[PDB]
Each structure stands twice: as structure tokens, then as C-alpha cells.
């Protein structure tokens, strides 16, 4: 019947105060939460943040709201949320967030005869996380998400997850292009500020870099220019005016890689791991041009010394550079 | 009990005016403040501003709000803030700011039986600060933050900090990549406009540049091109058609450094300290090409003069450039 329900809700709201949390003098409230993740949009190493969109749910139990005469479990419109009590809940490591308001504001009110209240949301959050780029790009990032109450202390409100094998779903929906997902952890603390002890639930997960792309970008140029710096050893010195045309170009090419490839890179002050790598390949083409520099000063003394340099040459650069790889590719992995 | 409190609040708001500040005819109000800083996001030298996020707190004491019958210290919902008096408070050197409204608007109301009212906020502020880039990048920046009332003069309202060794916390949480934090100062003034004298509290702190990065960017190119401008002195003049190929390239390379490295730089009209440095290394490779220019005009007169030029040459450039460093790296530090 339509008749029972309208006067039933009005009995539940006549004299219902909105300014106070339930069980005010007595025991603290026991609020559980639940998160379903839709997707993670993008990760900016420039701004050290990321953007996701979740489904945010909450339980609590108010004795002020307890119908009796209806066996059904109710469902109301979102405009009743301005006439009820909700707990204050905010995100700690965020920078900008909002609630989707496409046709209405996406929030859900659901009731139960005991007083169990379900409160859904749909929030897009730009949350910031600090990054360590010492091992860039062979890195593992741990970007987190923390949830707090704001006004109430731990004497009034009690956060808890709804089971560690639960309450975080939608994991395999996450498709980052650049990264990959590893692990989940769930945290419950008691953080104490200058006012008082506050509860906190935290969400944390690893991020692993997909390595199989930057070889195409960074490494395969710097592989080949080492080999193009080795052309001169098989070049007989009759093109002594044209040997340097290689030796200028390769040193110039590393400068372009130092700069034009830098345009696709973030900006930190401390030294990245690829910077030591680009320091290493820059030194060899700097020394490969210093092959001919010692040629032209003592070639006039004797060519017999200059006849033996390419015996010295092509037995050093294809091993010091190869051992430079095994220092590089093993100190990290 | 639930029964006492609801009628207690209604006695506190029946006939409570919102249009007037407490102790209206009498003495001025005595409002204290308190700031906790979460993080500083980014510093734009392009826009001369920075972005932080704080916890903003206030005290005052209204005799209109004084319950008696409850030994507890209360805590209310943020919707009661539209039915109370708050002091007008704004930031002076800002450009755009807002209040986080993730699930609710993050503000806190807390009461006490005497009338002590605590009012919390959570504000992200893009505040502008002027920069001096004479000593770029070996600079110290003093970006500030000032807080004023808006409508009330000093006859009504009185700002004060809650102890100089207090009221600014969260210092070591600040992690800028580029900068570093030095010192804190706290200011209380009496600023007078055309209307009347208004109070002000100000927050100020130094910013020191992390120097150990721009060597990798700016200096180590300009170090090496000076040495690559010294290759020709050990080059015997048989490659007189190929000496100039060095001398064109290095002068061209400084032009790229003048332009492509300029793409990663701000824009001011007055001369930066690195600009005098890039002026200096540009002159030497301009004069190193003017070595061979005086070669080819009087080589036909005698080679005996041209036999002595590299005796003149490599005893001047490795000292005038080295003394150019000691003028540079000591006039600043």
C-alpha cells in the first residue's frame, strides 16, 4: 500500500535532529566501509599524482530510524540525504576531487528495519603520491590512499574494513598502459593529532614499470651510436679529413639524445639511473674521437705506432663497453 | 541522555542573531589562529606563485553560547556553521583558492561550556610571490603568506598566534624536489588602509635552490665545448679545410645551447647570472675560431709566425678560462 509508507517516514523525521550523531552520550558508532574501483585514469610523474574513480560505500546503525510495520527493505531518493546524518569522511592525500552530478548527484540511501543504513557515492579523485626515481625506470612505486574522519575523535567513530578478502574489488578492471598492478594491503591505524586520536583506513598497492618500451626509445639509439663510433677503426687514414666527420657527428648525436630525448622526461634534481647510462655512452664516443687526436700528433713521428693502434683499439672498446653492460644490467635487476 | 541536548541547542539558537559579532558595543574580540601544513605542491617561476594545502584553525569566545548542564565538551556537524558567526578571514597574496568538498565540506565545529569555539578548515591555496632572479640559480627566495580580516577594523577584532614555538607545524612533511626549507618567522602588524587600521598575521619562510642538478644540464655541456674548441691547437694545419669544421660547429653548438636550453627556462627581461656565464663561453669559442682567421692571412707572409701561435695559444686559453671560473664561482658564493 502507498498509505502506510508516507506517514511512516514522517514519523521517522518529525523531531529527528540532524545536528547530532547517533548514540551521542553512549558508546561510539561502528562504521564499516567498502570500496569498488572503476578505473585509474593516468599517472603524472610531472605532478606526482594519479586519478581514479571509485564506488564508495558505508554502513552504520541508527536506532532513531527503525520502522516495524513493513517486511520490505526500503530504498529512497537521494534528496533525503540532506535530511539525515552522515559521517564526515575525506581523503588525505588528494589534490582535487568531486562528485558526479550527471543527471542527479550519484548517491544512494537504503534502509533496513533495524537501522542499518547504506550510503553509496561515486567519486573521482586526483590523489598525490611521492615517487622515488633513483631506479628510474626500473622502479617500483607504492602510491597509497588514506581515509579519515574530520571532526570526530576515536571516542565517537570507529572505521573498519568489511573483511580483508573483501571490500576492495574491481582489481582486474585496472588497465594502465604504462604500469602493472601487483599487490593489495589494508591498514587500520590510530593517528593522533594535536587535538585527539583519529581513526584511519588506508589503501595501498604497488606499481611496476612495464620495461619493454624504453629500449625502443632510449637504448637502441645509444646501442647503435657505439657501433657507429667503431667505423673509424676499419677506416684507413686516407680519409683523415673525413674520419672526423664521423667523430663530430656522434658526439653531437649524444648531445641531441641528451636534450631532445630529455623533452620526454620528468624533472628531478637527483641523478636518474638512465643518466649514468647516458653518461657512460657519452664517454666512449668522447674517447673514440680521442683516438684520432693521438693519431695526428705522433703519426709524423712514426706510422708504425699508428699501425698498431687499431690493434689496440678494436680489442678494448668491444669489451669495456660489453662489461659496461654487465655492470649496468645486473646492479639493478 | 539524548533528551537534554536537543532542547539545549535550541535554547542556544532561539533568538541568536547571526548578523552581529559578539561583545558588539564592548571590548574587541580576541581571536587566535593555528596552521598545520600538509604539503606544498609546486612552484612556478613562470607564474611566480606556489600551491600548498593547510589545516586552518581558529579560536574565539562567545558568551552567547554557554551551556551549563553537560560536563562533556561537544562536537557538532558542519551544517551548523551556516547558523553561527564566523570572522571574515582571507588570504592576501593568493590567486585562486577553494575548500575541499569531497564528501562534505571539510569544516569542524567544536564547543565548550565557557564559549570557546574551535573552527577548522582545509584549504588549498595558490598564492603568488615575487621572485628575484639576479642570482639565478644560486638564489634564495622568500615567499610569504599573509592573513587579514576584511570588514572589521582593529577596534573589533584581534589576531594573535598561539605561541611562536607553536601554531605552525608539519614543517618536515614539506618535500619539494627542487627547493629546500630553511627558516620560519611569524609576524603581527597593524596595517592601515584608507578606511582604518586592520590586523594582520603573516607567515614567511626561505627557499634555497638545490644546486646539484644544473651542472648536469647547463654546465657540463659548456665545460666540454671549451675543450673541444682546443682540439685545433694540436691539429697540424694540413687539415686547413677541416679545422673550420670544428670552428663552425662549436659556435653553432653554443647557439643551440642559447636556444634549445632556453626552452627549459623562465622569461625575465633583466640578465640572469647564467646568461653572463653563457656569454662568457660563447666569447671563447668565438675567439677560438678567430685563431685560424689570423692564421690564413699571414701564413703566406711567413709560417714562422704561424709556428709560434700554438705556443701563444695553449698557454692563454687554459688560464683565462680557468680564471674565468674563479671570477664566476666566487662572486656568487
Amino acid at each position, epitope marked *: 500500500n502507498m498509505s502506510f509508507v508516507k506517514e511512516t517516514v514522517d514519523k521517522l523525521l518529525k523531531g529527528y535532529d540532524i545536528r547530532l550523531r547517533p548514540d551521542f552520550g553512549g558508546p561510539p558508532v561502528c562504521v564499516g566501509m567498502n570500496i569498488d574501483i572503476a578505473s585509474i585514469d593516468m599517472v603524472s610523474e610531472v605532478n606526482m599524482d594519479y586519478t581514479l574513480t571509485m564506488y564508495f560505500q558505508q554502513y552504520w546503525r541508527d536506532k532513531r530510524l527503525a520502522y516495524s510495520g513493513i517486511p520490505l527493505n526500503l530504498t529512497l531518493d537521494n534528496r533525503v540525504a540532506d535530511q539525515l546524518w552522515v559521517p564526515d569522511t575525506y581523503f588525505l592525500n588528494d589534490k582535487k576531487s568531486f562528485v558526479h552530478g550527471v543527471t542527479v548527484k550519484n548517491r544512494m540511501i537504503r534502509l533496513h528495519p533495524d537501522g542499518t543504513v547504506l550510503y553509496g557515492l561515486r567519486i573521482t579523485t586526483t590523489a598525490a603520491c611521492m615517487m622515488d626515481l633513483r631506479r628510474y625506470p626500473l622502479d617500483e612505486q607504492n602510491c597509497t590512499l588514506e581515509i579519515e574522519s574530520y571532526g570526530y575523535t576515536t571516542d565517537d567513530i570507529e572505521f573498519y574494513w568489511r573483511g580483508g578478502d573483501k571490500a576492495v574489488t574491481g582489481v582486474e578492471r585496472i588497465e594502465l598502459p604504462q604500469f602493472s598492478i601487483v599487490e593489495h594491503r589494508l591498514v587500520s591505524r590510530n593517528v593522533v593529532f594535536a587535538t585527539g586520536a583519529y581513526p584511519r583506513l588506508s589503501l595501498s598497492f604497488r606499481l611496476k614499470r612495464n620495461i619493454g618500451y624504453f629500449i625502443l626509445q632510449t637504448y637502441m639509439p645509444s646501442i647503435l651510436i657505439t657501433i657507429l663510433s667503431w667505423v673509424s677503426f676499419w677506416i684507413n687514414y686516407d680519409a683523415s679529413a673525413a674520419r672526423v666527420a664521423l667523430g663530430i657527428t656522434t658526439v653531437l648525436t649524444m648531445t641531441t639524445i641528451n636534450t631532445h630525448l630529455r623533452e620526454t622526461l620528468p624533472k628531478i634534481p637527483y641523478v636518474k639511473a638512465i643518466d649514468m647510462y647516458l653518461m657512460g655512452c657519452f664517454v666512449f664516443v668522447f674517447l673514440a674521437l680521442l683516438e684520432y687526436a693521438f693519431v695526428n700528433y705522433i703519426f709524423f713521428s712514426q706510422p708504425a705506432r699508428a699501425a698498431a693502434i687499431d690493434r689496440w683499439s678494436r680489442i678494448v672498446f668491444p669489451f669495456t663497453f660489453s662489461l659496461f653492460n654487465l655492470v649496468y644490467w645486473l646492479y639493478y635487476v | 541522555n539524548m533528551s537534554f541536548v536537543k532542547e539545549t541547542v535550541d535554547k542556544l539558537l532561539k533568538g541568536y542573531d547571526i548578523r552581529l559579532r559578539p561583545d558588539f558595543g564592548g571590548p574587541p574580540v580576541c581571536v587566535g589562529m593555528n596552521i598545520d601544513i600538509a604539503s606544498i605542491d609546486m612552484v612556478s617561476e613562470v607564474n611566480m606563485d606556489y600551491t600548498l594545502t593547510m589545516y586552518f584553525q581558529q579560536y574565539w569566545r562567545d558568551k552567547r553560547l554557554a551551556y551549563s548542564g553537560i560536563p562533556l565538551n561537544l562536537t557538532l556537524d558542519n551544517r551548523v556553521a551556516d547558523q553561527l558567526w564566523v570572522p571574515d578571514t582571507y588570504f592576501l597574496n593568493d590567486k585562486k583558492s577553494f575548500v575541499h568538498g569531497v564528501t562534505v565540506k571539510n569544516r569542524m565545529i567544536r564547543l565548550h561550556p565557557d564559549g570557546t569555539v574551535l573552527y577548522g578548515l582545509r584549504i588549498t591555496t595558490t598564492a603568488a610571490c615575487m621572485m628575484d632572479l639576479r642570482r639565478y640559480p644560486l638564489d634564495e627566495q622568500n615567499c610569504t603568506l599573509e592573513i587579514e580580516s576584511y570588514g572589521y577594523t582593529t577596534d573589533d577584532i584581534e589576531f594573535y598566534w598561539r605561541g611562536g614555538d607553536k601554531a605552525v607545524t608539519g*614543517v618536515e612533511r614539506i618535500e619539494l624536489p627542487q627547493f629546500s626549507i630553511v627558516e620560519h618567522r611569524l609576524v603581527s602588524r597593524n596595517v592601515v588602509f584608507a578606511t582604518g587600521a586592520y590586523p594582520r598575521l603573516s607567515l614567511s619562510f626561505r627557499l634555497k635552490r638545490n644546486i646539484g642538478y644544473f651542472i648536469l644540464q647547463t654546465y657540463m655541456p659548456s665545460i666540454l665545448i671549451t675543450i673541444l674548441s682546443w682540439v685545433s691547437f694540436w691539429i697540424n694545419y694540413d687539415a686547413s679545410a677541416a679545422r673550420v669544421a670544428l670552428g663552425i660547429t662549436t659556435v653553432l653548438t653554443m647557439t643551440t645551447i642559447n636556444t634549445h636550453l632556453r626552452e627549459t627556462l623562465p622569461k625575465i627581461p633583466y640578465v640572469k647570472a647564467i646568461d653572463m656565464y653563457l656569454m662568457g663561453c660563447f666569447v671563447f669559442v668565438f675567439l677560438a675560431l678567430l685563431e685560424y682567421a689570423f692564421v690564413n692571412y699571414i701564413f703566406f707572409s711567413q709560417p714562422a709566425r704561424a709556428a709560434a701561435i700554438d705556443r701563444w695559444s695553449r698557454i692563454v686559453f687554459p688560464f683565462t678560462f680557468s680564471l674565468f671560473n674563479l671570477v664566476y664561482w666566487l662572486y656568487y658564493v
Partner: nanobody
Amino acid sequence: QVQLQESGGGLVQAGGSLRLSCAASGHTFNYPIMGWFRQAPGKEREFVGAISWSGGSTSYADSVKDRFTISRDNAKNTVYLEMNNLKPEDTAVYYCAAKGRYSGGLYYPTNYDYWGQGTQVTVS
């Protein structure tokens, strides 16, 4: 997973000046801000000071304002407590600890995660 170790303490008479060593091992980037502690034999434990991990800032208790100093390393990333002007009220075993990026105000002891076996430091 941070493992710590203490060294530097012992038996020093009044007017002394020492250094202790919190040996930072394992990963570090998850726990930037570290700090020291003290504990009387009967009285409950309390706080002395903490540092920014990038070395940019220090903080101190009011009773030992301007008397202790705390080092900072980037090489081995371990910290030290160099000081002057001994005070005989400071007879306390000392400790070091660390916090996450979001774990509250610095003054409170239960907000920190890892603990080392401290050195008995006695005023004689």
C-alpha cells in the same frame, strides 16, 4: 622492513658531550622522517626531536631548546646526536624510530613503527 641498530652510549660523567648512532638499514624511502627519544627508569617515555629526511629541517623539545643537535647522512643515511652542555636530569636510555609520510604530529610516541634496542646512557 627497516632494521635499526644502536651504538655510541656508555658511562660518561657530567659535563659530557657524545654521539649515538641509529643504523638505518633496509629501504628508507617509505619512512622519511625519523627522530630520537628518551625514557626515564620510572617516568613514562617522551620525545626529544626529529629531522627532515632531506636535512632541510629539525625540531626540538622546549626543555632542550638549542642544546642538542642531530646529524644527517646521504652516504650511509644514518643519524647521530651531537651535543654540548650536559644536564644531569637527562639520565635516560635513548632510542630512534621512524614514521610514514602520513602519521600525525611528531611529538607522540605511538605514531612510529620501528624500534631499536637502545643504549644505556648514564650521567655520572
